[PDB]
Copies of this chain bind each other. A is one copy, B any other.
Amino acid sequence: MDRIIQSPGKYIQGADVINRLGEYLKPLAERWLVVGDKFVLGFAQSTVEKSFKDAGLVVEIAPFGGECSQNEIDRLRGIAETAQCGAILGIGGGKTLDTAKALAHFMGVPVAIAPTIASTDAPCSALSVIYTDEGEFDRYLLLPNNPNMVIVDTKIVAGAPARLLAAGIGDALATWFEARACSRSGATTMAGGKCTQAALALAELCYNTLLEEGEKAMLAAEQHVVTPALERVIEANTYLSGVGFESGGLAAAHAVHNGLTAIPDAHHYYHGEKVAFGTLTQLVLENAPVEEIETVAALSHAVGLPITLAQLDIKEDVPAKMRIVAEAACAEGETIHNMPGGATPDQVYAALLVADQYGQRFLQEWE
C-alpha cells in the first residue's frame, strides 16, 4: 500500500528554551492560552509571561486542573474563547500535554507542546491512550495531525527525578524492536501506511542512541545538570521514539504493557517501566539472539528499569496473573498481531514467564 510518515511541524530543544517561547510561537498565532502544569508554573510562570510579552503576544495562563477529563477540556475552552485565543500551548507532564492537544483539536486551532519531563514518547504523537478508571488499557484515541511545535527545555527536564528519565528510556527502548517487527511482518503503522525508510532509520537511531548515551545521561540526570549525552537521550526519548513508534509501528512490547495494566499489581509503576518488561517479553516471543537480549537486559538494568516481574511488584499468583496479562495482550485490535507470524495467548503467556526467568538469572550473574 502507501508509505506514510507523520511528524510535528517543528521540534526544538535546548537549555532554558522557555525564555524563547514567544519568539518561536509568534508565527503560529498572536493570542495564546497556556494550559500549565501547576508545579511548572509555580517556578516558571514569571519567565513564561515575560517571554511572551517581549515578543508582543497576549497570554491567558490557565493552571491545569490535574486530570485530562472532558470537564477540564470544557472549562479550559471557555477561558480560551472568552480571551479569543488562536492557539494553545501545553507545558508540563503528559496529562497536561494530552489536554492541550484535545483542547486545540476541538477548537480547530494550532497546538504547541512543551514537555517538562522526558518519560514517554507521547508528546510528538498525534495520539492519546484512553484509560478506564480502574487503571487498565482501553483504546488508542487518534488525532488528525501532530502538534505544530514541540519545545523541550533540557534544563527543566534535568530537574525531574532521574526515574522519570529512565522510564522514558524504557518506553524508547521498545521503538526499534517494534518497528523492526512491523517491517518484517508488513504491518501497518499508526500513521496508516507501510514503513518508510525514514521512520525505520529514526527508530534504529533511537535504539543506538540509548545504548551509547543511556548510562551517561542517567548520570547527568541524577545531578540535575545538562550534558550532551543528556541532550541526545532527551531527543531519543521525545522526537526519535515519537516518530519511530507512530510511523514505524507498534507490536508485542506495547501489547504486553497494555496487558500488564489489566492487573492491579503494577499500577504504581510508570508507562516506560512496564514497556521495559514488554520489550524483554517481545524478545523472547520472537526468539531474538542471545547477544541481543543480553544487551537490552543489561541497559535496562543499568538505568533501573524492571527486568523481572517482582520488580513490578508482581509476586503472588504469578501464573494466574500472567494468563490475564497474556489474554489482554492478544485481544482484538491489539498490536501483538503485528508480530511476524502473530501470537497466541499461550505464546505470550510462555514469553512472560520465560522473560522473567531470564531476568532473574541476569540479576544473579550480575553478582
Residue in B closest to A155 when the chains form the complex, CB atoms? B346
A180 to chain B, nearest CB (A): 13
Contact of A9 among B3, B145, B155, B358 (CB under 8 A): B145
Are A225 and B353 closer than 8 Å at their CB atoms?
yes
Interface residues of A in 128-158 (CB under 8 A from B): 144-146, 148, 155
A218 to chain B, nearest CB (A): 9
Are B240 and A198 closer than 8 Å at their CB atoms?
yes
Roughly how many angstroms separate A7 CA and B149 CA in the complex, as a whole number?
A: 11
* In the A-B complex, the 8 residue pairs with the closest CB atoms: A2-B14, A225-B350, A228-B287, A27-B144, A7-B7, A201-B205, A223-B353, A219-B354
Q: How many copies does the complex hold?
A: 5
A343 to chain B, nearest CB (A): 11
Are B346 and A15 closer than 8 Å at their CB atoms?
yes
Roughly how many angstroms separate A228 CA and B350 CA in the complex, as a whole number?
A: 10
Q: Report 9 cross-chain contacts, Cβ distance below 8 Å, ordered by A residue.
A: A3-B13, A11-B196, A13-B196, A186-B340, A197-B240, A216-B284, A216-B354, A222-B357, A229-B287
Q: A6-B9, A186-B340, A350-B226 are in contact. Are A205 and B196 (CB under 8 A)?
A: no
Is residue A272 contacting chain B, with contact meaning CB distance below 8 A? no
Count of chain A residues with Cβ under 8 Å from any Cβ of B?
Answer: 75
Are B28 and A2 closer than 8 Å at their CB atoms?
no
Chain A residues proximal to chain B, CB less than 8 Å:
1-15, 17, 20, 27-28, 144-146, 148, 155, 184-186, 191, 193-194, 196-198, 201-202, 205, 209, 212-213, 215-216, 219-220, 222-223, 225-229, 231-232, 235-236, 239-240, 243, 284-287, 289-290, 340-341, 346-347, 349-351, 353-354, 357-358, 361
Roughly how many angstroms separate A184 CA and B3 CA in the complex, as a whole number?
A: 19
Are A354 and B225 closer than 8 Å at their CB atoms?
yes
Are A12 and B4 closer than 8 Å at their CB atoms?
yes
Are A239 and B198 closer than 8 Å at their CB atoms?
yes
